[PDB]
């Protein structure tokens, strides 16, 4: 039960850790498009989606794993009009790391912390 | 990590796989009431509820497992007034397969992919 | 294992789910709502609701033989983010009082929850 902490993903806005590493598997908190350096949220959904994903990647990479070890995501979104766009960025991101797509749920919620357009949690396995 | 692929469940409409088998645990994507043979979404909530659960079954069977191996489900729905009808179908489903009911979370979201009334993810264990 | 968890210190399952499942290495709970197990009532105030959801989570993990410090992931479904700073405070004090490290978390505002409660919380805990 190792805690994961990285500056490549935003610090906790709250009583949670960024990730926990169980040995066989890794859980991340839900990541929002907040910039780890600047604390800023990008306006466009293309960018928010790239940024949530990088934030997830930082925690998974800080555990010593890679994108291809990601087996499950939930993508929580505020607007299904943004859907094809989120999917393009998210495919590109997996393809970039030559990783097969994880299992996934995608739901439209009412609202997200800081009024972001999306939030992504992940589960990775070691082997 | 072994990807699960079956034609008894709908082909992914985006960058995901229907299931992943970790040896120990199997994760499904969130199953919506899309008909694997036609692409149709049934109109009635009873039929939609029945149909997500058959899609979940289909992926868990393809992994070599069965419905009584499911330990967790998350049921995302668009209307809590549909709950008693969803509960009836879902109870019958597990009862039919002589299955112990899993842990479950049920929440009403704003909207789902393809304007479906529910989306169900499952987690199963091998032994 | 696939052991069902059953406790009277959390509200009983009336419906097609069980309170929790113990798998050996990990415990999963059902989503817990702020329904009081003795009175069957929902407190009106979100701090009370938050505290109670957490109690209800604790009851089931503890019935599994584990403790709060073993909880490794939560998802907090809420109906109003305006309640969030308040829920966070209650949630923090709950972990601090158990001397527990904070789990991983996801928090979203959904449209609605069972019984019009203000939050539902599910938990994943590991044995060691």
From Swiss-Prot, chains A, B:
This is Putative reactive intermediate deaminase TdcF. One of its GO terms (biological process) is threonine metabolic process. The gene is tdcF. It comes from the Bacteria. Pathway: Amino-acid degradation; L-threonine degradation via propanoate pathway. Substrate binds at residues 104-106, 119. Homotrimer. Gene3D superfamilies: RutC-like. It comes from Escherichia coli (strain K12). Belongs to the RutC family. PROSITE patterns: UPF0076. Its EC number is 3.5.4.-. The lineage of its organism: Bacteria, Pseudomonadati, Pseudomonadota, Gammaproteobacteria, Enterobacterales. SUPFAM superfamilies: YjgF-like. The modification N6-(pyridoxal phosphate)lysine is found at residue 57. GO terms for molecular function: deaminase activity; identical protein binding.
UniProtKB/Swiss-Prot annotation, chain C:
CDD domains: YjgF_YER057c_UK114_family. Pathway: Amino-acid degradation; L-threonine degradation via propanoate pathway. One of its GO terms (molecular function) is deaminase activity. It comes from the Bacteria. Substrate binds at residues 105-107, 120. The modification N6-(pyridoxal phosphate)lysine is found at residue 58. Signal peptide: none annotated. It is an enzyme of class 3 (hydrolase). Its EC number is 3.5.4.-. GO terms for biological process: L-threonine catabolic process to propionate; threonine metabolic process. One of its GO terms (cellular component) is cytosol. InterPro entries: RidA (IPR006056), RidA_CS (IPR019897), RutC-like_sf (IPR035959), YjgF/YER057c/UK114 (IPR006175). Keywords: Hydrolase, Pyridoxal phosphate. Belongs to the RutC family. This is Putative reactive intermediate deaminase TdcF. It comes from Escherichia coli (strain K12). The gene is tdcF.
């Amino acid at each position: 039960k190792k805690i994961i902490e990285t500056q490549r993903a935003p610090g906790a806005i709250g009583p949670y850790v960024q990730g926990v590493d169980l040995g066989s598997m890794v859980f991340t908190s839900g990541q929002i498009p907040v910039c780890p350096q600047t604390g800023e949220i990008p306006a466009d959904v293309q960018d928010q989606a790239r940024l949530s994903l990088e934030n997830v990647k930082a925690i998974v990479v800080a555990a010593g794993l890679s994108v291809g070890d990601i087996i499950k995501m939930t993508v929580f979104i505020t607007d299904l009009n943004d859907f094809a766009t989120i999917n393009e960025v998210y495919k590109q991101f997996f393809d970039e790391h030559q990783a097969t797509y994880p299992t996934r749920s995608c739901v439209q919620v009412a609202r997200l912390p800081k009024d972001v357009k999306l939030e992504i949690e992940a589960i990775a396995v070691r082997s």
